[PDB]
Design a protein around this ligand. Structure first.
Ligand code: HEM
Ligand code: HEM
Ligand code: HEM
Ligand code: HEM
Lengths: 146, 141, 141, 146
């Protein structure tokens, strides 16, 4: 990862203020609402017919939280994303059949949700550092596709 | 495809941006140049320093065009004719760059209009910016 | 857009392809699966082994669809209507994947049609595949 | 760069059979004809208005040979593509202002020209090895962009 010390701490300081329950459900929820193609993978989650149904769905919310916890592990092992996400890489490939192109979509919704929550604090330089991280994650998740 | 529902959301949202659109345009470009450095290759004759007067002014021109597209949402192709020629035939901007500018716009709106940026509105704006991008890259080849 | 010259080029090339269409289709698919493994995620239910009959079989279907597009070159959006609903609404295939299949088909025609694959014909075939991919991806939301 | 020793040997074996002078001119020529938006970068080459004007242009053919020579340097240093291309990356960024998306277009065109020349010898597995190589070269040429 081409992250600078100023950026690594830019990311870390912000991350410590993140409400994982709110941001996780909001990110996974918006993924499903803004890019309805992705619902194909969550048909087992139940009712996802409308925005209000997606955003209020307890399995959506709970799963979002899990996704953020894995993101968290990545921020703590930034110099080794490839090794941190390897198992999850194999999982999303072997069991779930997810096209890695979807990983970029979640990264970007994620960035939009951070901006929604932090306002002024999510300044252009902070977003740039988050953009590098989210790409890092997306690449790490695609690495074991075969 | 822009549904009437989408058109209503876009009109609402854009109406809320009101006279701040110019400010949001310049911020979106700044976010783009920092986050996605490759987009700078299209602006080598620009002074791209933070707070640059060129970027400010160009930000206003981007916002006004989008203001125009909202007003002409059922007729975007005709109303964006000139810009489409310029982007697809003179500048020859690779389509990928439009996805980068749209995301930066969405970030900007998210950062400044927290109450209006609902999941439904987000979706509508995203489809709106995709449609604009399609028209601006269409007559390439 | 297609030009009259592009249409002529596409019809001649596709005409030399002939009965071998199905075989080229199958090769394209194989090249895709090996060169770009992410594509396999859309076929978890296929046998994708080298030489697979399911792949040979699927190849023929893709090839026939293209043959139909060539027969209705002036009305592709309606001729590929049912395939557009399939790809874009039931399978929900991300658009980058069409560029990869398009490229692999081009590699396949280049390897089998030495004499036909001139720069001009290569340009036309690329635009045609782009037009087909656009239609199949058109109702994406 | 994930190249197994078999892929590496397949890449290197085929490449010994290539006439770089010829292949380079064909590859750069087809880029300019198939993706005519790239022509804006070479207005000093003269007339590029028709396919023949392009394919037979002596400046096109000379430049194509330059490009394929740098490509050859890359094949001899597969385990350090980023260092090999560092100065070329900066140049394509700072001096020529070329959007790196264009590097992907050339890599793909080059793969079509190889298939055109070698025919059936250019098998699915050999192609896969070549894609990983041109993707690696494109990523290396893009790394010093800032
Ligand atoms: C930053 C990118 C992503 C991260 C970090 C991530 C992380 C996770 C994690 C932690 C799990 C739970 C795995 C376990 O049980 O051990 C999960 C499961 C899953 N993910 Fe993701 N994921 C990402 C992107 C996606 C995308 C984009 C999709 C699909 C569009 C997706 C669809 C799934 C599905 C279908 C499951 C299984 C859920 C179930 O148990 O029913 N994920 N992923
Ligand atoms: C929502 C998408 C976009 C809109 C609405 C937009 C709008 C504009 C407008 C209004 C102009 C001024 C043209 C005039 O004077 O009439 C402009 C010029 C320009 N645009 Fe965009 N644009 C968009 C996306 C892009 C992208 C993605 C790039 C490249 C990454 C780009 C690069 C340029 C450049 C280089 C110019 C010429 C600047 C100059 O020298 O004055 N634009 N565009
Ligand atoms: C030239 C562009 C393409 C054409 C002309 C094409 C044509 C077809 C046709 C004719 C079918 C059969 C429909 C039927 O069963 O009646 C098909 C099914 C399918 N296609 Fe494509 N296709 C294209 C691109 C793709 C791409 C890019 C992917 C994904 C990487 C893809 C994945 C599928 C899948 C998963 C099926 C269903 C397989 C099955 O269950 O039988 N196709 N397409
Ligand atoms: C494998 C990918 C590529 C390689 C290895 C490559 C290598 C080269 C080399 C060696 C030069 C000569 C450098 C010099 O003058 O000092 C060159 C110059 C140049 N390259 Fe590339 N290049 C690549 C892709 C591209 C692409 C795709 C474009 C643009 C579409 C591009 C545009 C140029 C231009 C405009 C010049 C200067 C031309 C002149 O003499 O006026 N290159 N590149």
């Amino acid at each position: 990862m081409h992250l600078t010390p100023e950026e690594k701490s830019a990311v870390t300081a912000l991350w410590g203020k993140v409400n994982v329950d709110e941001v996780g459900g909001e990110a996974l929820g918006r993924l499903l609402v803004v890019y309805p193609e992705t619902q194909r993978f969550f048909e087992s989650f139940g009712d996802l017919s409308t925005p209000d149904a997606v955003m209020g769905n307890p399995k959506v919310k709970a799963h979002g939280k899990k996704v953020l916890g894995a993101f968290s592990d990545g921020l703590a092992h930034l110099d080794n994303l490839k090794g941190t996400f390897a198992t999850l890489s194999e999982l999303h490939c072997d069991k779930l059949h997810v096209d890695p192109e979807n990983f970029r979509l979640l990264g970007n919704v994620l960035v939009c949700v951070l901006a929604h929550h932090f306002g002024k604090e999510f300044t252009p330089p902070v977003q740039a550092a988050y953009q590098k991280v989210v790409a890092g994650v997306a690449n790490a998740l695609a690495h074991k596709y075969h | 495809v822009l549904s009437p529902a989408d058109k209503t959301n876009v009109k609402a949202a854009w109406g809320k941006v009101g006279a701040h659109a110019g400010e949001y345009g310049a911020e979106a470009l700044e976010r783009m140049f920092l986050s996605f450095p490759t987009t700078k290759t299209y602006f080598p004759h620009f002074d791209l320093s933070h707070g640059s007067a060129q970027v400010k002014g160009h930000g206003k021109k981007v916002a006004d065009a989008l203001t125009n597209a909202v007003a002409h949402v059922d007729d975007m192709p005709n109303a964006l004719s000139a810009l489409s020629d310029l982007h697809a035939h003179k500048l020859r901007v690779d389509p990928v760059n439009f996805k980068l500018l749209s995301h930066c716009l969405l970030v900007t709106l998210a950062a400044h209009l927290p109450a209006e940026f609902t999941p439904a509105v987000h979706a509508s704006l995203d489809k709106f910016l995709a449609s604009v991008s399609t028209v601006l890259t269409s007559k390439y080849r």
